[PDB]
Amino acid sequence: PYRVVVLSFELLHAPATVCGPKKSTNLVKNKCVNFNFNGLKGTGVLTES
């Protein structure tokens, strides 16, 4: 007896259903660094406000 599971996922990407972001990194401050907080990208320094 071998247990088997069949997996099928659709396509065409219009009903975005599962996806996955993962890959969360650390934080630094008062240094020049590229930032990609939530999809937006840029270069600069991070401090308080």
* Site of interaction with other proteins (CB under 8 A): 45, 47-49
Judge contact between 16 and 1, C-beta under 8 A. Answer: no
Minimum distance of other proteins from residue 25's CB (angstroms): 23
Q: Which is nearer to other proteins, 12 or 27 (CB)?
A: 27
Within 10 A of 49 (CB to CB), how many other CB atoms are there?
Answer: 3
Minimum distance of other proteins from residue 47's CB (angstroms): 5
**Dist. CA 40–CA 21, nearest whole Å:** 14
Minimum distance of other proteins from residue 4's CB (angstroms): 59
